[PDB]
Design a protein around this ligand. Structure first.
Ligand SMILES: Nc1ncnc2c1ncn2[C@@H]1O[C@H](COP(=O)(O)OP(=O)(O)O)[C@@H](O)[C@H]1O
Ligand SMILES: CCc1ccc(OCC(=O)N2CCCCC2)cc1
Ligand SMILES: [Mg+2]
Ligand SMILES: [Mg+2]
Length: 265
């Protein structure tokens, strides 16, 4: 069906481990979209074909305003191309680098949008497992969209692939290679809420080996400016024992989220 010849390619939108992502326009319709380019030698080398397949199958069948659409894919003997919805206001990561920290109202609205999207995923027993600022994109009204389903799965699960880069968003069960379920996305939602308010994630350290210790002990503290209601929410989410983390309905109905968020359930 689609091939490269059908698109005019434009400026680079970003880079990941594998993905080189470009703005593009479809020639006959003039439809503007994002083309995510993957090199086949590099997918074969890392042995992550099953991850690409999961990304395509899970993301193309989900439909939610706070989840990024995938429309299709094609392939050309050196490259695989994923046809994505274009997010014009860029990443939450870039926005945090611009502002240093978010205020309480911005933070609670993003958390509501995230918990809405995750509640929808979990209702299909899809776990994302890689929630972090560079995988959250922003639509034309500034609304948050989860993207990058390459690590996503059905629960319950173990981890059969090597963690590559940062431990900062992963919970204890996951870094210790244990078994895990839906509740890992709850833990990453705690880490995000802290990083939005403070400017850095709560277990950040200078080495892999020390980050690993801080996470497995849940060693975090709060700066004076973080309010009592923020603290309460974050402290309920960052629990070592996954079963004690709240359900997402409890997150969306937490008093501090209802006082501060400018969007609903
Ligand atoms: N649909 C898109 N619209 C705008 N920018 C995007 C989009 N998808 C990816 N990007 C940019 O490209 C980066 C890498 O995309 P990603 O899908 O997260 O690749 P990887 O799987 O390699 O992490 C993102 O962090 C963001 O900067
Ligand atoms: C090749 C470029 C391309 C573009 C679009 C597409 O589907 C578009 C589509 O379903 N909607 C439906 C929701 C609103 C508009 C987008 C498939 C391929
Ligand atoms: Mg990514
Ligand atoms: Mg990926």
């Amino acid at each position: 069906q689609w091939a490269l010849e059908d698109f005019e390619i434009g400026r680079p939108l970003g880079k990941g481990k594998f993905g080189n992502v470009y703005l593009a326009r479809e020639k006959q319709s003039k439809f503007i979209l994002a083309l995510k380019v993957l090199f086949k030698a590099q997918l074969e080398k890392a042995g992550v074909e099953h991850q690409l397949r999961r990304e395509v199958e899970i993301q193309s069948h989900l439909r939610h305003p706070n989840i990024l659409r995938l429309y299709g894919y094609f392939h050309d003997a050196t490259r695989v191309y994923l046809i994505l919805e274009y997010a014009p206001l860029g990443t939450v990561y870039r926005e945090l680098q611009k502002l240093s920290k978010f205020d309480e109202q911005r933070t609670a609205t993003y958390i509501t949008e995230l918990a809405n999207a995750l509640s929808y995923c979990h209702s299909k027993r899809v776990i994302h497992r890689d929630i972090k600022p560079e995988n959250l994109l922003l639509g034309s009204a500034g609304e948050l969209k989860i993207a990058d389903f390459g690590w996503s799965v059905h629960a319950p699960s173990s981890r059969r692939t090597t963690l590559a880069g940062t431990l900062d968003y992963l919970p204890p069960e996951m870094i210790e290679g244990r078994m895990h379920d839906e509740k890992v996305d709850l833990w990453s939602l705690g880490v995000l809420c802290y990083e939005f308010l403070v400017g850095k994630p709560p277990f950040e350290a200078n080495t892999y080996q020390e980050t690993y210790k801080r996470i497995s002990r849940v060693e975090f503290t709060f700066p004076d400016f973080v309010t009592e209601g923020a603290r309460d929410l974050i402290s309920r989410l960052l629990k070592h024992n996954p079963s004690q983390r709240p359900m997402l309905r409890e997150v969306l109905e937490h008093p501090w989220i209802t006082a501060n968020s400018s969007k609903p359930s």
